[PDB]
Structure 1
Amino acid sequence: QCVKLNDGHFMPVLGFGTYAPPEVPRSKALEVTKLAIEAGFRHIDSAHLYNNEEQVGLAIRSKIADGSVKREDIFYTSKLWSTFHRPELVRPALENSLKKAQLDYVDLYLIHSPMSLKPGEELSPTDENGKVIFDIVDLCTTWEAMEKCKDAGLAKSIGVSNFNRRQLEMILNKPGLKYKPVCNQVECHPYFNRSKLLDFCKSKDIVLVAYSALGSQRDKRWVDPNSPVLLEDPVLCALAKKHKRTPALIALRYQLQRGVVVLAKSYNEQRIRQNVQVFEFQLTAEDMKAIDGLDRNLHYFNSDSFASHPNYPYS
């Protein structure tokens, strides 16, 4: 139930998504992360951006203290936020995340996004029009700082998120590169299946990790309400009926069968327990072809605040 990363460490192929929007009480992350571990999730995905690392960390530490898991059984991810791309800010950002979570190391630390933002106090600094104040940082220098964090033992593995093929290539061609990214965590689902990026990642031994695999949380801040609702897709519905599973389970299994590590966020006890059933059934070649046919270049995260950035990954 794991994949071997290009640095020798192992990553569980099903991960628990911990982001919930600010209107959800912070205490919920503690409750649901414990439930996720109880259900069998061993890969837990968080970030500085999520304002939940204390709660998620506490959940992990609670399950270690009561004997349910060892630290070595848990794969915990955090991410460097975009206001901290300047190399001198990388290690301090990681140390802050470790202090919040009360952990000695993260299993994985990612550059959250290639879209560098102005260093400062704000998560999303703005001008007048609500467009973000961008920063211009050579992400190869950021990567060097990430490498130093691995060497120091603060992160077992390092990788990237929201990078396109070209951006990934720039890191891979860096003179004196010490560690390749182990993964690229990107938006990935049947409406945006990333086939060409997946092929590229496979060719370089980089794991593609899918987020919004269930169609995203459809947050009004970044997602058009008109966009088709992935879990109401008729083809996924037909496949769910055929296998007597659910559309969510079909969407998750699709990713595993393509060699994509898949995340799944749920703050509902029943759905958390449901999602671990992804290992209990298989899709046929014809099922996979049907799902492949759904691709319509649809990234749910689709806002002016992303699209105007000079390092916006989508074309």
Structure 2
Amino acid sequence: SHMATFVELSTKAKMPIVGLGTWKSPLGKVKEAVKVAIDAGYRHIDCAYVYQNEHEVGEAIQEKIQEKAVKREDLFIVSKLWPTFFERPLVRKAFEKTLKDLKLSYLDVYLIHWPQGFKSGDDLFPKDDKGNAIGGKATFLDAWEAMEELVDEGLVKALGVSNFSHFQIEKLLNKPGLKYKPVTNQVECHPYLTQEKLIQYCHSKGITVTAYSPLGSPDRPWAKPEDPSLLEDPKIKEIAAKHKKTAAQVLIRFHIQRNVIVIPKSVTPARIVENIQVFDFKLSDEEMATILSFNRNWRACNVLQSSHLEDYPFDAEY
């Protein structure tokens, strides 16, 4: 039995510092993955409408609660609002489908998945005659206002953002009539993209950071052979070998020691367990400084041609 350390949010709620990622977790395999995770002691599950497996995640959670392996109050479930649903009636609807699929009566955190709004419709990635993203009318500011109502009604404990630059967070924080603040900013983070300035900014505002693709997302479709590879990095493995841990475990522990929440994905039971056995060792300061020095500003998660739309986040330095 394992328990991830808690990171305290500005709402005083306690967010487990390690969680289970579920993107690319196939139907069939994801339900068992969630169950294994829960038995191992995971309490934080990272989900999303756009991952299209929330119902199987729902099945697993429901079955675990019923068989009394875990209570709802101790689970920490996060999901996200996809950019094609920023318009107010759509925000409520998408949230309702997410909540239904997950068989929950409330979410612990509901995130804006990406800052840029997309054209509404029966289409997740609307594009033009080329492959250019088509933007929508409603902005993340519009969306947030609708999301704030979910909090007012007790349907969501807290709100957050994902893939936001500090400029975009500045925009949200200075928004007139702001009712709720983001408790986290979920962004790609790993030794090739250390996010030093964005983490500094977020923490200075009482906003935690959730590190996604911490293993370099080797199963991302668009991966290309020349693309860097964290898990195969010999310097990483070298440090791993020293602590009698795997490369993955070092890549997870890295975030823990920056007080950054981290959500590695796996559907392999052995790996799921391995990924949470990271509270029995420490990386030295020298090791941390070394790992930080690997920064290459390389984004594994940057495949969509969307730099023309107004709220594209990665043009900003941070």
The answer on whether the counterparts of 2:99 and 2:106 sit within 8 Å (CA) in structure 1 is yes
Q: Structure 2: which 5+ runs fail to align? A: none
When normalised by structure 2's length, the TM-score is 0.94
Structure 1 segments of 4 or more deviating over 6 A?
none
CA distance in 2, matches of 1:224, 1:173: 40
Q: In the alignment, which residue of structure 1 is the partner of 2:192?
A: 191
Residue of structure 2 aligned with 1:19, choices 23, 27, 34: 23
* Structure-to-structure mapping, 1:63-142, within 5 angstroms: 63-142=64-143
The answer on whether the counterparts of 2:44 and 2:77 sit within 8 Å (CA) in structure 1 is yes
Q: In the alignment, which residue of structure 2 is the partner of 1:4?
A: 8
Q: In the alignment, which residue of structure 1 is the partner of 2:247?
A: 247
The answer on whether the counterparts of 2:209 and 2:260 sit within 8 Å (CA) in structure 1 is yes
Deviations 1:233-269 (A, max 9, x none): 1221110011110111111101010010010101111
Instruction: Look up the SS of the partner of 1:122 in the other structure.
Output: coil
Deviations 1:113-170 (A, max 9, x none): 0121100111111222222212243322211111111111111111010101100110
* Structure-to-structure mapping, 1:188-227, within 5 angstroms: 188-221=189-222, 223-227=223-227
Q: In the alignment, which residue of structure 1 is the partner of 2:290?
A: 290
The answer on whether the counterparts of 1:218 and 1:224 sit within 8 Å (CA) in structure 2 is no
Instruction: Look up the SS of the partner of 1:59 in the other structure.
Output: helix
Instruction: Look up the SS of the partner of 1:109 in the other structure.
Output: strand
Counterpart AA for 1:258? R
Counterpart AA for 2:255? Q
**In structure 2, do the counterparts of structure 1 residues 255 and 241 end up closer, same or farther at CA, with 3 Å as the change threshold?**
same
Counterpart AA for 1:231? L
**In structure 2, do the counterparts of structure 1 residues 188 and 180 end up closer, same or farther at CA, with 3 Å as the change threshold?**
same
CA distance in 1, matches of 2:78, 2:72: 13
CA distance in 2, matches of 1:216, 1:259: 21
Q: Once the 2 structures are TM-superposed, how far is the Cα of residue 232 of structure 1 from its aligned partner?
A: 1.1
CA distance in 1, matches of 2:308, 2:220: 19
Instruction: Give aligned-pair identity as a percent.
Output: 47
The answer on whether the counterparts of 2:240 and 2:247 sit within 8 Å (CA) in structure 1 is yes
Counterpart AA for 2:135? F
Deviations 1:52-81 (A, max 9, x none): 111001111111111110001100111011
Q: Once the 2 structures are TM-superposed, how far is the Cα of residue 86 of structure 1 from its aligned partner?
A: 1.6
Counterpart AA for 1:295? N
Q: Once the 2 structures are TM-superposed, how far is the Cα of residue 310 of structure 1 from its aligned partner?
A: 3.0
Counterpart AA for 2:236? L
The answer on whether the counterparts of 2:202 and 2:209 sit within 8 Å (CA) in structure 1 is yes
Instruction: Look up the SS of the partner of 1:79 in the other structure.
Output: strand
Residues 1:267 and 2:267 are matched in the alignment: yes
Q: Once the 2 structures are TM-superposed, how far is the Cα of residue 201 of structure 1 from its aligned partner?
A: 0.5
**In structure 2, do the counterparts of structure 1 residues 101 and 304 end up closer, same or farther at CA, with 3 Å as the change threshold?**
closer
Q: Structure 1: which 5+ runs fail to align? A: none
CA distance in 2, matches of 1:113, 1:138: 11
**In structure 2, do the counterparts of structure 1 residues 178 and 304 end up closer, same or farther at CA, with 3 Å as the change threshold?**
closer
The answer on whether the counterparts of 1:224 and 1:302 sit within 8 Å (CA) in structure 2 is no
Aligned residues: 311
Structure with greater proportional helix content: 1
